[PDB]
Design a protein around this nucleic acid. Structure first.
Lengths: 172, 197, 136, 106, 190
RNA sequence: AAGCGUUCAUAGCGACAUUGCUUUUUGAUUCUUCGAUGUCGGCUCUUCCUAUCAUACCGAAGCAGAAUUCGGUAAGCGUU
RNA sequence: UGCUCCACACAAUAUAGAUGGAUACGAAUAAGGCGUCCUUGUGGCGUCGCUGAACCAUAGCAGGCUAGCAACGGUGCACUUGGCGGAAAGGCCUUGGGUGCUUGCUGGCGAAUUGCAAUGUCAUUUUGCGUGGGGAUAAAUCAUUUGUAUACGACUUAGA
């Protein structure tokens, strides 16, 4: 599913004879399609307001893609992740080009770091870091230093044949 | 492509080498393994011994002369990593082991022929840099195989003779390349360059 | 009185390192490293070759010795002008690597009659050079 | 010249088969160097032959021969499926079978 | 974590020349020379002006990046072995039975022997490594000085003395007897 | 780890608990054998286990040495 | 007129599988290969690798015949000088000569009826009858017997 897309969502309670024209809550949702996004919305509004999707309705669904979708940027992202024996808040800072692509990475490594599947990850808020020197993760700050230069040593080489004859080099 | 290939196992994971050989046998390729003593297994050498002694202890109890024959030669320890690695019980598997010739070191006449390698099973390509690899040339010495020295000088003797072979080859290789460039630039090569050669 | 050490030169990873993409929709075009994300993901742009300015894992690309300076986080047109100014493409084709790839695909396209020509042509270059070896 | 084959070699792998069930109906073939089902269709459909030597001659040839057609690609490694007019004797595992270039499709 | 880069500085004084290919090093200086393998470290070396050597690691993990500081602490130790040399002055402490050591050449092979240890007749010969010279510091009681270039070998020899004179099957904490390193000095005082 | 252990909770321990393994005990049950699987103990015979009694090497101590006690690798060797 | 080995048939069966070529450094890879140069190295400088998709070879009735040209080569085929090679050497390389082919080049000659494809056969073994040459002219066992041996075997004996 990891080919996520940020589907912006607006939902509202069903109209009632007492108070029509309801509150019309809105949310951004990170999901692999329109469908999961629709319910993922319903999961979150299931939390913060007395409403279920049967008693409510989805006024609209739309797609989101970054204004400059090929510009690198730093993301400051909060999340609560359901631990093995509980749950904790969690504040990572990941540097990726697309807002969705950041989550593509984030859901991947959180599953690696603390074995939290896509099931229980609740992104509290994604906050793209608007400038530099305001992040607090060294593994990102080391990408914020100037003239980032380094080699990629020990290059791997795929082989389309099971046999070679060269004792392949590894220089790169 | 070559029906009988002299495969060299220098710096090759024993497991990964086994499969890329397990396949080729069952495709029917004639396979001769050489330089088998100094194959590589992934893990710390000390622990590579422990797992063997655990396997070494494993034997039938009622008659220790008919149980799992714990071979010791580096070629044979690799060979055992081909039994079970290949369906040895059936005749097809038996014919597979028939068409496989594991040969420690470089016995004749394969020395005078090309030692193919396996890109996949290479230690350099597969191991994370800095991880603990282990050569079987020292392990088999540490676990009973007793011919480390004799193969050491024998391989030493072949290498110093082979080096001269290459030294003679390089001399001739130089002259053919020198004549290549000298005869190059000719109009015939001009078609070749345009044509694709 | 002289100390000797070898730097063991690599193909460095930097903004301004001309790259060759290997696999994917492009699979063989040239690009410049726009900006690095991490050690396994970078930014590439192919205005001279039609490769859309994108972020790609390094696994689908291979670095080149080629080198040219341009600002980080650059845009497509900014990439283009320096690409044209430094004449990277032409000197890329000047690299012996370029000929090998080209003749590889040139070989992949030559036809049977061309094959038969080389069959004859290889024998002409054979005889001409072989006598020189014999005279040698 | 020195080569007279007008076929591409083919190593016969095995039966179309599951773990503990094998099917004589379909057999698997590998062509040397062919890589992907992207360019395996080129060999797909061609007439293919299993040549072998018999102890006694039958019809003016000690070399009895088996006929079959390659049907479809198989896996992602360029292995192809082939049906033979007479199923392989299962001794052919690892035997080089010929892959002819007709019916031509170019 | 894999820091993309890590750096260390090797301060080579002008009296020492360095030759490094692969991971094999060889210094040349007035004291002599030393050669050591590093085939298990996976680092990089480079130079500024043939006085500063820059060792580096790219994309190294925490356990990996530790070694980068070690080898710098190793190579400068090479320098001090060839610009200073390492002096290990020893002490022959004993309760009642004094320690006697015999500079003795068995057969072309030098071994230092421990005799009179607790009045015991053990021929406790100990091998001595190359360049490691044994001299009794005169004018001061119960010292032995181990002089040599390679800090590892000179210390390893001294460590061997520590263990070879190790009193057994007794509560050592008051059986203070044995052999002990007074100081970890240098051949030259600079 | 409350306390004992001169002083010191953890040399030795170690109250109040509390978390494991075992089938070498004995439990509970009845899955197996009622058209037979010979049931204790002894004799002798051998292998295996370690959760070590001595033996090799060590470590600790309220271990001056000996006797010591705990602890480690250790089933090779023995255990009348 | 046994037996073996050299040449050939040919006849048989027998094939875990020929249908261009196993086309030969080592070591290392966070490093080398190759080339030039020398104040000879852990050297200088340069090139190169980023796939064997490479190198050779490869055209001729399934590879026939004939003529000619530019050369002194390739290239079989065997011969021969030698050398090398004991890890399972059993092969490698070389001198020299002859031999055929040569598609380096030009020409000419014949290809047909298997009739629209029907592998359209070209190998590797070994034997068996024989061809026609070479070499060579024995053991073992039973039985008798001895005991260092023994249930019987076996072993150890001795015996023109």
């Amino acid at each position: 599913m990891a080919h996520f897309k940020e589907y912006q969502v607006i939902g509202r309670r069903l109209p009632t004879e007492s108070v029509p024209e309801p509150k019309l809550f809105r949310m951004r949702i990170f999901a692999s399609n329109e469908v999961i996004a629709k319910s993922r919305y319903w999961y979150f509004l299931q939390k913060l307001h007395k409403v279920k999707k049967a008693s409510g309705e989805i006024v609209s669904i739309n797609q989101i893609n970054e204004a400059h979708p090929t510009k690198v940027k730093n993301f400051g992202v909060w999340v609560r992740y359901d631990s093995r024996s509980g749950t904790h808040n969690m504040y990572k800072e990941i540097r990726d080009v697309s807002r969705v692509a950041a989550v593509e990475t984030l859901y991947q490594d959180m599953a690696a770091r603390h074995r939290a599947r896509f099931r229980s990850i609740h992104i509290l808020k994604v906050a793209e870091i608007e400038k530099t020197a305001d992040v607090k993760r060294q593994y990102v700050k080391q990408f914020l230093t100037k003239d980032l230069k380094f080699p990629l040593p020990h290059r791997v080489q795929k082989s389309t044949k099971t046999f070679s004859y060269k004792r392949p080099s590894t220089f790169y | 492509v070559e029906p009988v290939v002299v495969i060299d196992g220098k710096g090759h994971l024993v497991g990964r080498l086994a499969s890329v050989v397990a396949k080729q046998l069952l495709n029917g390729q004639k396979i001769v393994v050489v330089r088998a003593e100094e194959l590589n297994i992934s893990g710390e050498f000390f622990r590579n011994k422990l797992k063997y002694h655990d396997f070494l202890r494993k034997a039938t109890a009622f008659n220790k002369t008919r149980g799992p024959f714990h071979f010791r030669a580096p070629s044979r320890i690799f060979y055992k990593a081909l039994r079970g690695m290949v369906s040895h019980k059936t005749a097809r598997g038996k014919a597979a082991l028939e068409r496989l010739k594991v040969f420690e070191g470089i016995p004749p006449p394969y020395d005078k022929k090309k030692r193919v390698v396996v890109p996949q099973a290479l230690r350099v390509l597969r191991l994370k840099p800095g991880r603990k690899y282990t050569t079987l040339g020292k392990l088999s010495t540490s676990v009973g195989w007793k011919y480390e020295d004799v193969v050491a000088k024998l391989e030493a003797k072949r290498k110093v003779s082979s080096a001269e072979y290459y030294a003679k080859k390089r001399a001739f290789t130089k002259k053919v390349a020198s004549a290549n460039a000298t005869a190059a630039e000719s109009d015939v090569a001009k078609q070749l360059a345009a044509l694709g050669y | 009185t002289d100390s000797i050490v070898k730097a063991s030169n690599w193909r460095l990873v930097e903004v301004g390192r001309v790259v060759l993409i290997k696999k994917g929709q492009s699979a063989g075009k040239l690009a410049a490293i726009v900006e690095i994300i991490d050690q396994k993901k970078v930014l590439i742009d192919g205005p001279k070759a039609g490769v859309p300015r994108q972020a790609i894992n390094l696994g689908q690309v291979v670095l080149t010795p080629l080198t040219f300076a341009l600002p980080r986080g650059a845009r497509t047109a900014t990439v283009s002008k320096k690409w044209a100014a430094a004449a990277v493409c032409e000197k890329w084709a000047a690299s012996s690597w370029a000929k090998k790839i080209a003749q590889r695909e040139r070989r992949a396209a030559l036809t049977d009659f061309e094959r038969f020509q080389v069959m004859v042509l290889r024998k002409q270059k054979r005889y001409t050079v072989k006598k020189a070896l014999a005279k040698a | 010249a020195e080569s007279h084959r007008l076929y591409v070699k083919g190593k016969h792998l095995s039966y179309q088969r599951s773990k503990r069930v094998n099917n004589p109906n379909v057999s698997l073939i590998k062509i040397e160097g062919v890589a992907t089902p992207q360019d395996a269709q080129f060999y797909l459909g061609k007439r293919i032959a299993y040549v072998y030597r018999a102890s006694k001659e039958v019809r003016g040839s000690k070399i009895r021969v088996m006929w079959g057609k390659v049907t479809r690609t198989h896996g992602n490694s360029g292995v192809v499926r082939a049906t033979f007019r007479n199923n392989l004797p299962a001794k052919t595992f690892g035997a080089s079978v010929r892959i002819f270039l007709y019916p031509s499709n170019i | 974590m894999k820091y993309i880069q890590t750096e260390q500085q090797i301060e080579v004084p002008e009296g020492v020349t360095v030759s490094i290919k692969s991971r094999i090093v060889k210094v040349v200086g007035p004291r002599g020379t030393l050669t050591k393998n590093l085939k298990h470290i996976d680092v990089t070396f480079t130079k500024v002006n043939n006085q500063l050597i820059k060792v580096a690691v790219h994309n190294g993990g925490r356990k990996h990046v530790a070694a980068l500081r070690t080898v710098k602490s190793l190579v400068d130790n090479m320098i001090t072995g060839v610009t200073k040399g390492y002096k290990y002055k020893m002490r022959y402490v004993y309760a009642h039975f004094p320690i006697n050591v015999n500079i003795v050449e068995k057969d072309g092979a030098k071994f230092i022997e421990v005799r009179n240890f607790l009045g015991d007749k053990k021929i406790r010969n100990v091998p001595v490594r190359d360049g490691v010279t044994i001299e009794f510091s005169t004018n001061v009681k119960d010292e032995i000085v181990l002089s040599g270039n390679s800090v590892e070998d000179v210390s390893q020899n001294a460590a061997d003395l520590q263990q070879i004179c190790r009193v057994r099957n007794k509560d050592i904490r008051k059986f203070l007897d044995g052999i002990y390193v007074s100081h970890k000095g240098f051949i030259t005082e600079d």
